[PDB]
Amino acid sequence: GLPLVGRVAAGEPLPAQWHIEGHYQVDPSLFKPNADFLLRVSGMSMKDIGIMDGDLLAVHKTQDVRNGQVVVARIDDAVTVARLKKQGNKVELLPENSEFKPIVVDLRQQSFTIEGLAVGVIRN
Amino acid sequence: GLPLVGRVAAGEPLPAQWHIEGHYQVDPSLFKPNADFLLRVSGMSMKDIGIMDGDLLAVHKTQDVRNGQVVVARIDDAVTVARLKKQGNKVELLPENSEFKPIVVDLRQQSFTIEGLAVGVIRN
């Protein structure tokens, strides 16, 4: 149905090499854009918009996203989910939780890859 | 497929004549116990546990749910979702948001229906 391929950090980016863990029979269409894969969230950085550690994050595999959206970003194979805010060569990955702080990423100091766009949560 | 039968208030119990509004292709087996139907959440009373306004709440239909669990209950024909705590003929419906107050129900005073157990969330 829809494949689970690993985790993503809702806090300090954790490293991870994704591979199919399981399959959830869920109409990928329920999400807009359609959901391509799932990631087990780990952390409470995004708890204010309802994303909880342990939740499955539905993601649409894309490479272009606009500010204010919420994406799954990888840095040195360390993945994290947060609200984007690119400006010049600097990229801010903002959280949804007061106890946490943003995470600036310099495009000319390190490699930055957008893994996808957050299009919905699943919690069972 | 999973049937959406209407709204549920994550706050003050709201009036709702449940009726099959749609079907979501989502294995009922993904939740434990199996989900029998969905509800549209309305309000922020259960925000502290990730249940946000607009969220689809999975529900297993049963009358017998125990203290501490999140239930879907009906009072004066209006439905709500909250944490359960029943002692004798006094039932408390607790929220998950400091901004809201708990609801008290005296079983000698009125009819009290437990629609089902909340067992999941889908956000799309």
Side-chain angles (χ1 to χ4, degrees), chain A residues 24-27 30-31 48-52 119-124, chain B residues 24-27 30-31 48-52 119-124:
Chain A
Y24 296 96
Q25 290 299 307
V26 179
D27 181 1
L30 298 173
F31 308 89
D48 284 325
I49 56 170
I51 302 171
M52 309 297 278
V119 300
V121 160
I122 297 183
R123 184 184 311 157
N124 50 156
Chain B
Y24 293 74
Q25 284 321 305
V26 172
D27 178 14
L30 288 191
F31 316 83
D48 289 338
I49 60 174
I51 302 179
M52 312 287 283
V119 301
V121 170
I122 293 176
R123 180 177 300 141
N124 65 324

Side-chain angles (χ1 to χ4, degrees), chain B:
Chain B
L2 274 187
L4 170 44
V5 310
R7 304 205 310 296
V8 63
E12 170 183 44
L14 48 89
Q17 283 295 292
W18 287 346
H19 184 271
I20 300 298
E21 284 144 54
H23 288 76
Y24 293 74
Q25 284 321 305
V26 172
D27 178 14
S29 170
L30 288 191
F31 316 83
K32 223 210 71 170
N34 287 198
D36 296 287
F37 64 100
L38 307 158
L39 289 173
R40 168 83 63 182
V41 176
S42 175
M44 287 294 147
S45 79
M46 301 307 275
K47 66 178 276 286
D48 289 338
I49 60 174
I51 302 179
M52 312 287 283
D53 189 74
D55 287 23
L56 300 168
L57 194 81
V59 185
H60 162 77
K61 201 169 191 59
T62 182
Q63 190 173 187
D64 304 331
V65 172
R66 58 180 60 188
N67 276 44
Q69 295 186 292
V70 175
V71 304
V72 170
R74 207 192 276 278
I75 338 173
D76 45 286
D77 297 331
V79 284
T80 180
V81 48
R83 174 137 276 136
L84 181 62
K85 191 185 184 51
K86 166 172 178 276
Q87 290 187 304
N89 44 284
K90 177 190 174 177
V91 167
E92 294 188 73
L93 289 175
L94 309 167
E96 279 299 353
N97 183 338
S98 308
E99 182 65 10
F100 289 85
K101 315 176 180 174
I103 297 175
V104 174
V105 176
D106 190 335
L107 307 186
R108 282 165 298 172
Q109 296 302 77
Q110 50 185 161
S111 299
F112 173 84
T113 303
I114 283 176
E115 299 294 12
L117 178 63
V119 301
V121 170
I122 293 176
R123 180 177 300 141
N124 65 324

Side-chain angles (χ1 to χ4, degrees), chain A residues 4 25 30 36 65 71 85 87 99 102-105 119 124:
Chain A
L4 179 58
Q25 290 299 307
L30 298 173
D36 287 305
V65 306
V71 297
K85 208 174 196 305
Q87 291 196 57
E99 291 300 327
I103 292 179
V104 180
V105 176
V119 300
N124 50 156

